[PDB]
Structure formats: structure tokens, C-alpha cells
Amino acid sequence: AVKIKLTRLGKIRNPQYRIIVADARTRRDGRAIEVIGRYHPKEEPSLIQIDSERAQYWLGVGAQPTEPVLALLKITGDWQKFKGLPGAEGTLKVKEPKPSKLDLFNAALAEAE
Amino acid sequence: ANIKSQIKRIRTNERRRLRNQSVKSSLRTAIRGFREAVDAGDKDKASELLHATSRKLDKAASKGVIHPNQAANKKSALALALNKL
């Protein structure tokens, strides 16, 4: 069975997953047909990067996702874009970019008075 | 064995083996009858046995005892033998 999966990567207490598509008969850390996203749940917003077009291809040709990646697709709206229930939600929230070190540098220079 | 599922699958596999055995044996019997009718030279008897044996080969392929491609090759051989007769 072709399936969307999470391949674990990363060090011991840093489970950075890579969202792949692979047969169910493979192994977790094994050969992947295609990589379509990544999933880093150590961020508080717990990064959910994905590739929507290829996700839609593999779902259309019948790749049964796992439960976690199903939830991720529900977040990104690709599950909903596939079935069509609320069109495409777009529930995704990203980590806000912290201020630039140059901006901090100039701010502290200004404070240096 | 030492696992429940295999202990059961032994019985199941023996059952399916007996089934497929009976079926394939019937098929080989039909084919030897057909080939006897042909090498003797009878024609209408051979055609009737051909229809019957093709039916049984389709049937076994549907049951899964054999592959449909195998059934096809067998019955094709029968038909061509009958034709060239």
C-alpha cells in the first residue's frame, strides 16, 4: 500500500520528520519514492512545511496517509483541497521571524546614549 | 509449530491444498481425455471436450487455483490442436 509517512531524521531528542510517500511494506527510515514535506514539532508552532501539488497527486492516485500526516494535511488544507468539504481551510500558522541581529545592533547603538 | 496463527494456517493451507489438488487433477484428466480424443482422431467429441475443459479452466482461474493466463495458454493449445486436426 502506498502511503504518506513521516521518516524520522535528526538527533536523539530532536525528532525532525520528513514527510515522504512510500509503500507501507517499507521501513520507517527507508527508501522514499518522493519527499513532499517536513515536520519539525520542536518549534512551538511545530513547523509543517509541505509541497501541495505533489501531495494532491499522491492523494489522487491513492496514497493513504498515516494519522499524523493526515492531521498535517488537514492543517495545510490539502486534505480539504482533495476532498472538497470546506474548500481549502488553510489552518497553518508559522513561526514569526524574530528580529534581525542587525536591527538589534542598531537599536542598542541608539540606546548607547 | 509454536504460534497460534501458524497452527491454524497449517489446517487452512492443507484444506486449500486439497481443494486445489482436486481441481487441478480434474483439469489434467479433462485434458488427457481431450488429447486422447484428438490423437485417436475424433473431432466432434474433441470439440465437446474442448468446450467442457475450457469451461473448467476458466472456472479454476476464477477460483484462483490457476492464473487466467495459464488457463488461456492451456485452452489456446487445445483449440489450436483441434483446428490443426
Binding site: 541581529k101 538589534l104 545592533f105 548607547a112 | -
Partner: protein, 200 residues
């Protein structure tokens, strides 16, 4: 680990006085040991090794780490020597020393390792922390009123400050414009004999 032994004797073996304040070497010139003032066979290997050890013991870096610094410099572009000096100067013990908060790299190492500093908000107990462009090195709230930093702010006119660095506050916040070039380094040493050593 680190070298917690006498400091003057390394400078004596290596000629250059890294810190200063002794009279034995400064009246009689000699490396340490009973066999000071001995006859020397003037080998290029000793020259090179002596510059490498000059760097090692001027900073607080051991060989298994200095080797990594050399390798980083050799891989990354430009001149391996000034890249290596840039690395050795772009570490926390050295930047606070050059900023004058400690007046000794040993003292700066003790301060950073004991956590009397931090960088961009997060505490740092790593003297080998490679600082970068646009780095605010704050001092924590106990440390600013502690005695060593009182001494820093009191005697912050003895040794100069590099250009790539500047202190900005009476609380002794430190800022990094960029990383130093060989003119900015200001260290009593070449940098070619060391790369020759590690190319041997």
C-alpha cells in the same frame, strides 16, 4: 580541559611576554628550567611549534581544538592564518578580554564559564562560543554589581579596545561591528609558521 599551571613560564619558553610582571626572565633572559641560557639548534620546527604554542597559551585553547580552528581556516577562503586569528579572537573569553573587563584571558575564561555574561539574551557558559557579526554581549544582573565588573568599569582605560568591538554602556554591554582583520587582531605573532606546522 585547560592549562591551570603557571603562566609566565610559557611566555618565557616562547620569548614573548604575553602578560608581564616578573623579574627572573626580565633580568636574566632565558626559558624556564635549570637549563635556561642553553645552546639552541635553531630548528624551523621549534620556531613553528613556538608560534603555535604562543597562540595556544595566549588564549586558553588546547591542541585538539586549535587543530579544528586551523582546519576551519584552511577550508574557508582567504588566508588560513588571518582566518585562524579571526577565529581565535572571535571567541567570548577573548572579546571580553579585549574589551578590558578582565585584563587576562584566564580571568575572562573564568567569567564566561561561571556565567557572568550572556549573548543576545541567552546565558553562555562557553568560552569557545564563536561570536558573530552584530552580537550584543550583555552582563547579567548580579554580575554588573559584583566586584570584578566594578573593577572593569573602574579601570576601563588601561588597555585599548579593538575597532571591530566597542563597549556601549556603563553596564559594560559590548557590541561587535564585524569580525577582525589581521590589522584589527593586534597580537604579538605571525600566522604563517602555524599553517606551515599543520601542513607538515
Amino acid at each position: 580541559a585547560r592549562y591551570t599551571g603557571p603562566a609566565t613560564r610559557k611566555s618565557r619558553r616562547l620569548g614573548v611576554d604575553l602578560v608581564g610582571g616578573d623579574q627572573s626572565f626580565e633580568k636574566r633572559p632565558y626559558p624556564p628550567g635549570q637549563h635556561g641560557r642553553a645552546r639552541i639548534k635553531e630548528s624551523e620546527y621549534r620556531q613553528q611549534l613556538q608560534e603555535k604554542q604562543k597562540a595556544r597559551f595566549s588564549y586558553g585553547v588546547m591542541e585538539k581544538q586549535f587543530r579544528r580552528y586551523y582546519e576551519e581556516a584552511n577550508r574557508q577562503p582567504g588566508k588560513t592564518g588571518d582566518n585562524l586569528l579571526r577565529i581565535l579572537e572571535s571567541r567570548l573569553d577573548n572579546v571580553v578580554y579585549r574589551a578590558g573587563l578582565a585584563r587576562t584571558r584566564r580571568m575572562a575564561r573564568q567569567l564566561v564559564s561561571h556565567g557572568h555574561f550572556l549573548v543576545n539574551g541567552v546565558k553562555v557558559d562557553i568560552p569557545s562560543y564563536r561570536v558573530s557579526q552584530y552580537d550584543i554581549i550583555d552582563v547579567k544582573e548580579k554580575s554588573l554589581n559584583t566586584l570584578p565588573f566594578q573593577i572593569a568599569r573602574e579601570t576601563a582605560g588601561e588597555r585599548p579596545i579593538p575597532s571591530w568591538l566597542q563597549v556601549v554602556g556603563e553596564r559594560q554591554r559590548i557590541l561587535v561591528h564585524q569580525l577582525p582583520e589581521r590589522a584589527q587582531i593586534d597580537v604579538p605573532l605571525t600566522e604563517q609558521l602555524i599553517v606551515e606546522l599543520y601542513s607538515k
